[PDB]
Design a protein around this ligand. Structure first.
Ligand SMILES: c1cc2ccc3cccc4ccc(c1)c2c34
Ligand SMILES: c1cc2ccc3cccc4ccc(c1)c2c34
Lengths: 49, 48, 49, 48
């Protein structure tokens, strides 16, 4: 039944890994954009005075 | 190996549910931070 | 072996649930603080002109 | 039920590892956003 155990762990590892990479990507996505937005607005505040 | 299938399935449902929840939360707070920032930028530019 | 299956799922559900609540708490923690920081700084920019 | 123990253990290690990684990332980006904000606040206040 060890091969079954191996398959159980492997299949859920793939699942866990996939959702992990997706959450990493999303966190990175929103953070990059928040930085962009902030740096853009700072340029306007300083641009207009 | 039907038992194996059910174990994987039951935990996949759990993993997927918590994943969708964390996604939703991240989107919620990021969207709000964007709104807040754009709001305050208007106030600063609106006050000179 | 169904009781074993049940125990496997339960034990990993507890684990998954715990790490979930922790990540939620952390996301909430940092977001609340970013909002606080932003709103504080806006008060200074507007306070000093 | 040693096989059961190893299944739980092996997946607990995986779950814990990805959890610590996501924590670290969240802390990394939040810390950086705080630094960026405090930096720009100084520039705006330093320019009038
Ligand atoms: C709760 C805790 C988690 C820890 C680590 C994870 C890694 C990848 C995807 C995940 C999805 C959902 C989780 C829920 C979670 C994940
Ligand atoms: C990208 C997305 C985020 C969503 C929610 C957050 C909550 C608190 C601090 C955060 C910092 C950085 C993020 C980047 C981010 C945060």
């Amino acid at each position: 039944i060890n091969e079954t155990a191996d398959d159980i762990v492997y299949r859920l590892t793939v699942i866990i890994d996939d959702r992990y990479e997706s959450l990493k990507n999303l966190i990175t996505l929103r953070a990059d954009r928040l930085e962009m937005i902030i740096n853009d607005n700072v340029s306007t505040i300083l641009a207009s005075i």
